[PDB]
Every structure is written in C-alpha cells, then in structure tokens.
Amino acid sequence: MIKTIAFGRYELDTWYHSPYPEEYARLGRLYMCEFCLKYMKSQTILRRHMAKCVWKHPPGDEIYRKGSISVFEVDGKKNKIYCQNLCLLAKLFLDHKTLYYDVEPFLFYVMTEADNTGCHLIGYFSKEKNSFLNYNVSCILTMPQYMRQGYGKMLIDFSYLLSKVEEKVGSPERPLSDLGLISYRSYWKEVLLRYLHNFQGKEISIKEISQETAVNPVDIVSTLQALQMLKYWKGKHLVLKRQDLIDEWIAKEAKRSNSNKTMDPSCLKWTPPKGT
C-alpha cells in the first residue's frame, strides 16, 4: 500500500497510513495535483490532469503576502474537497489526526512559496471556527520537503498573530506530538526571551506576557520552567533573566534576521472571517 507520493517535483516517503479509498490505497504510490490536491493512480493520468487543472494556488482568500510567501485562508465548508484532500495528505505524516471528513467546522491556513509555475504548498495549520477550549491551532504540518528550514515556526507565529488580531489568547490543541512539542517549545522560548529582552520594568505578571504575545499563561509558565528561569528566594517567586540565554538568543536573532524566515505583521491583510 501507500509508501510514497509524487507531489510536484518531489517524491515523498509517507510516515503513517492515511485512510485513502482501497482502490488508491492498494497502490504503492499516489500522484497528487500539487495545486488542487486531487489524488490519482499514475503519472500519465496526473499529466492529463495538469493540462486541464485551472488552480495555481490554494482556494480561499490570500490573507498574508510578502513577496513569494503567502498564506491562504480556506473555509472547510466552502472548499470541502480541497480541505478533505489536505487532511488525508496530512495524515500521511501524523501519528494521529482527530479529523478527515467533517472539515466544515474548520479554517485551514495554507502557506505557499511562489515561483514562475504557481504557489507551491509549504505547509498548513487547521483551526476550529469555534473552539470551546480556545485552541488557535488544531493540527499543523510542514511538508517533508520543507522541514527544518524555519517554516514551521513561521506557521506557529502566524497562528498567534491571528489570535492577537482577534484579541484572544491561544494554545495548540492537545495532544502535541514529539515534533509539535519541540517546535512549540522553540517558539515559546524565542517569544519569551524577546519579551524579557525588550522589557525594562522591575516586575511582570504572566497575564501581561500572555496579553502581549497571545501565548497561554500555562505555556508561558511551562517555558519559564523549561528554561529554569523560575526561582524561589526569600519566600517569593522570581523570574531570573539568564545571561547566557539572552546572549544565545541574540546570536540566533542575528541568524533569523540573516535569512528571511519571519512573518512580518505588516503583510497581514485580514479581518476575522464572516464577522464570526
């Protein structure tokens, strides 16, 4: 059954089984239209599709654009087939996905890189339109060909940018995978150290940091703990701003600015969808 997929110019090994129909799942390899995400049985069928397919980017509204990097907001009710295909594609790299078919309650934020043939998929995150638990990300994926290049952190940052604009505090949906956890820890460390590096006051509450960053209070405390920056001396809880962490962060900040792997909030053109 499905061990690889042909996706644009890439050949990708799958990590997990995804519930594609038996007709397709029986085959060793699937051929995907990189723009509309239709899955097909062969290279020749794919070629015939590519000759006819009108799509050169995701559906929905392009809400972020900085040069060749875009994010498209796709409504699972308005573009059901696309979003189902995206969820089946995603499950090939997720140990567990809570959802495939019933995509209507979700928004999908699809990040692309443009070149002269169109806007190519980098990754995405899904988000419930109405989350009872205030989750700002349901699932998140960077396509394998793009992994470990900074795009995952861009996606995470973007999810918190939406939350800030919504005047909400956000958290990723539990449970978090190994790679999910590492990524979020890295982002939270970056955000917290930036806040403390820019902050000049003598004391700070977790709530204030949460208000600025849109990061959940629990995730901030968890990060302070992870960096061993929560201390106890003379009956009081202190935030210990470590020298090595601040200095190491500025060196990383230099390399972050050296490349262009950052989301620029001035390149967001968004109001929360359909009033809601």
Binding site: L196, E203, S205, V218, K231, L240, K241
Partner: peptide
Amino acid sequence: GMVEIEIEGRLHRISIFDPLEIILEDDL
C-alpha cells in the same frame, strides 16, 4: 489561576496575576 511545579526538588504554586520580580544574577 495558579500553576504547580517543582523547582530544586521543592513543589511550588504560582499566580499568573501577581507581579513577579525580575532579577539578573544577584547572589541568591
């Protein structure tokens, strides 16, 4: 809103609304 964790083998409970003092190195 309170969170519990252990620092140096001691269990603590911390408020998310109270101002927390920020320190650089400073002996302690």
